[PDB]
Design a protein around this ligand. Structure first.
Ligand SMILES: N[C@@H](CCCC[NH3+])C(=O)O
Ligand SMILES: N[C@@H](CCCC[NH3+])C(=O)O
Ligand code: NA
Ligand code: NA
Ligand code: NA
Ligand code: NA
Ligand code: NA
Ligand code: NA
Ligand code: NA
Ligand code: NA
Ligand code: NA
Ligand code: NA
Lengths: 292, 293
């Protein structure tokens, strides 16, 4: 259930910056039809930083409601204060979400022991499966394999979204955890490599606009058909890269709009609209992918 | 002028349950008044801004302002990674008595230079208070470049920057793009004296929590061009400048304050955790090197 192509879904907005349900419905219908394994709601790509606690909870519950049992929903529950993370987590207990994605605290740079006590306290206040999430380029801290191994012994700590793009982390973690600990890439451009080394899937921004390809690529990787997966990956590589040509989710929201998947590409400050150059680049990447 | 010299990034002292401890904060503020500290930054990074909710944050700022009682200026930490949050935090301290705001680049969501421009511009437009930008890429994932600083210096109440890269070339890259009354403050204790000798006007300092008079003298000596004497102080303090980050700030400086008798307990809020045995030994030796123990 926590394997294959998982979309880190955008939070579509109207021109005032409020959540646009009609657009989110369209995306969720698109992912059900495309074979996406699951939806991560209000991750980084979903602009977690700029939704307040109640808007955040509302978007997750909206996503769950619209999913209507057709596709599993994983809630973004990360926070850089352990009390905030527990409170967010408790908000979704017994909601119908199948698990949580909880990022290492950002900006206050805790120690490895700080991360251990942080994630352990979170896990002790829920029954939901917990997927750790490491992305040092955003957070200023690096959850190391040693610490992941300590945390994997905690009951409902069940996997990790590893977004460093450092592919040596795959088997560094795998040798410290049990066979059913889930290893998920959080870096689209290196995700097929990550799977070929033993990863079980990807929590993906590219899947927002290339869901069918991403789902088939990940299934082929799972079946060991890496040559066939790489043909898809190469079609998608310009998107993997150029969806970060400006701060995510600025490009992917523009791309969703360009494809008719959402009504507007509006974001909340401090995100700002895509530049002329960025549109040109993302459009070429979408054309390279065969989507335009 | 008011934003020069030694400015303490003051800890938020807590009791054993993690609640703000007014009695320890009062002692610290009296200590800074007697030590000649130029100003207090309230609820910055060293003050555990992340783990105080909006009401606790505002309460700590108002407490610090009340305890200072006009004896020393107070600068409120008002940064946020959502612009709406930053405006709302800023609006809370309008006409409170604080003299200015310290506002960090959005963290975790990694905005562009244009996003930083619009962020800080929108903030400045919702306040009459002086704004001090704060760049610390090692924490935020985001680097406010001098060109963008120069753009923002043209917004009238954006009046300075706390530059915490430790990259000393930024001093004059910024200074040549701004007017001469734009304030340049180090946010990196180990390189602060270097920063001032290159033209910086002061430092927003963690070391000043426990070596306030030394830090006040070092900055005043630097300001008067007495760099040889300032360097003597800096070498007394350099192990502290470094070892107060031997573990995540403010874990070492809070333990040092407790060991010096300045606060009652060294308690923090998760995901900060208590100082290790090795860390205590390292920080004690640095305190002894400064002559403080
Ligand atoms: N802007 C803050 C608050 C988040 C509120 C819940 N989405 C942060 O990024 O941590
Ligand atoms: N923990 C969140 C919310 C802070 C609330 C105000 N001190 C952050 O660091 O941005
Ligand atoms: Na709607
Ligand atoms: Na660490
Ligand atoms: Na540690
Ligand atoms: Na390790
Ligand atoms: Na487990
Ligand atoms: Na008290
Ligand atoms: Na402000
Ligand atoms: Na100005
Ligand atoms: Na400096
Ligand atoms: Na401690």
């Amino acid at each position: 259930m926590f394997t294959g192509s998982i979309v880190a879904i955008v939070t579509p907005m109207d021109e005032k910056g409020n959540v646009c349900r009609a657009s989110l419905k369209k995306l969720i219908d698109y992912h059900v039809a495309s074979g996406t394994s699951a939806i991560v709601s209000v991750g980084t790509t979903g602009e977690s930083a700029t939704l307040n606690h109640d808007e955040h909870a509302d978007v997750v519950m909206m996503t769950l409601d619209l999913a209507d049992g057709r596709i599993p929903v994983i809630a973004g529950t990360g926070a850089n204060a352990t009390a905030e993370a527990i409170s967010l987590t408790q908000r979704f207990n017994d909601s119908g979400i199948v698990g949580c994605l909880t990022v290492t605290p950002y900006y206050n740079r805790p120690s490895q022991e700080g991360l251990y006590q942080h994630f352990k306290a979170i896990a002790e206040h829920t029954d939901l499966p917990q997927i750790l999430y490491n992305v040092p380029s955003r957070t200023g801290c690096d959850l190391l394999p040693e610490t992941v191994g300590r945390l994997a012994k905690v009951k409902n700590i069940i996997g990790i979204k590893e977004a460093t793009g450092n592919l040596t982390r795959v088997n560094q973690i795998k040798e410290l955890v049990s066979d059913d600990f889930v290893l998920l890439s959080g870096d689209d451009a290196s995700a097929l490599d990550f799977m070929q080394l033993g990863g079980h899937g990807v929590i993906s921004v590219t899947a927002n606009v290339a869901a069918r390809d991403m789902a088939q690529m990940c299934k082929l990787a799972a079946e060991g058909h890496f040559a066939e997966a790489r043909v898809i990956n190469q079609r998608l590589m310009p998107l993997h890269n150029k969806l970060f040509v400006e701060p995510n989710p600025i490009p992917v929201k523009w791309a969703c709009k360009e494809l008719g998947l959402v009504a507007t590409d509006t974001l909340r400050l401090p995100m700002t609209p895509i530049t002329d150059s960025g549109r040109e680049t993302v459009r070429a990447a979408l054309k390279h992918a065969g989507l335009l």
